[PDB]
Design a protein around this ligand. Structure first.
Ligand SMILES: [Cl-]
Ligand SMILES: [Cl-]
Ligand SMILES: [Zn+2]
Ligand SMILES: [Zn+2]
Ligand SMILES: [Zn+2]
Ligand SMILES: [Zn+2]
Ligand SMILES: [Zn+2]
Ligand SMILES: [Zn+2]
Ligand SMILES: [Zn+2]
Ligand SMILES: [Zn+2]
Ligand SMILES: [Zn+2]
Ligand SMILES: [Zn+2]
Ligand SMILES: [Zn+2]
Ligand SMILES: [Zn+2]
Ligand SMILES: [Zn+2]
Ligand SMILES: [Zn+2]
Ligand SMILES: [Zn+2]
Lengths: 88, 89
């Protein structure tokens, strides 16, 4: 939550600079779920299918969040970390 | 939408299904984000570790939903399947 940190105008521009759900996966889950048996082998295959895309997405997310973290003041960092701890 | 008109035997059964069917990953993520530099190889390791938990969580979720689907009447399964198309998890 980067909104409730009282971002300065410079920080808002910096975040803009930094920042610049497939139905296939649902249909595969549906085929596993709507069946008269639970096929664990087929489910594990399903779960693993978009491993690479997940990796790319989560690396992008974590890098972006790290970049934004590092434009914060020490006061804002403490708030961001406190918020991080009180969520899950 | 649980607009499926669940039999008390069905609901009893569902609760039973659910009854049957952590922090480390989060703190590691936190420590990657709250770091002076982004460490890609470390982030990749965190992501790979999270794939373990995701597989456990997804298998339990699909198994649970499958068990539910199979306590349903033909008309309720049609409805369950229609609801499925509108949902995202
Ligand atoms: Cl679907
Ligand atoms: Cl944490
Ligand atoms: Zn700039
Ligand atoms: Zn579907
Ligand atoms: Zn199908
Ligand atoms: Zn199979
Ligand atoms: Zn396995
Ligand atoms: Zn793999
Ligand atoms: Zn790769
Ligand atoms: Zn993101
Ligand atoms: Zn996040
Ligand atoms: Zn980058
Ligand atoms: Zn430092
Ligand atoms: Zn495993
Ligand atoms: Zn679940
Ligand atoms: Zn089981
Ligand atoms: Zn679901």
């Amino acid at each position: 939550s980067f909104k409730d940190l009282n971002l300065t105008d410079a920080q808002k521009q910096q975040i803009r600079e930094i920042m610049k759900p497939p139905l296939e996966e649902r249909r595969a889950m549906h085929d596993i779920i709507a069946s008269d048996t639970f096929d664990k082998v087929k489910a594990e295959a399903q779960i693993a299918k978009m491993e690479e895309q997940r990796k790319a997405n989560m690396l992008a997310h974590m890098e972006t969040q790290n970049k934004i973290y590092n434009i914060l003041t020490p006061e804002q960092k403490k708030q961001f970390n406190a918020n991080f701890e009180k969520r899950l």
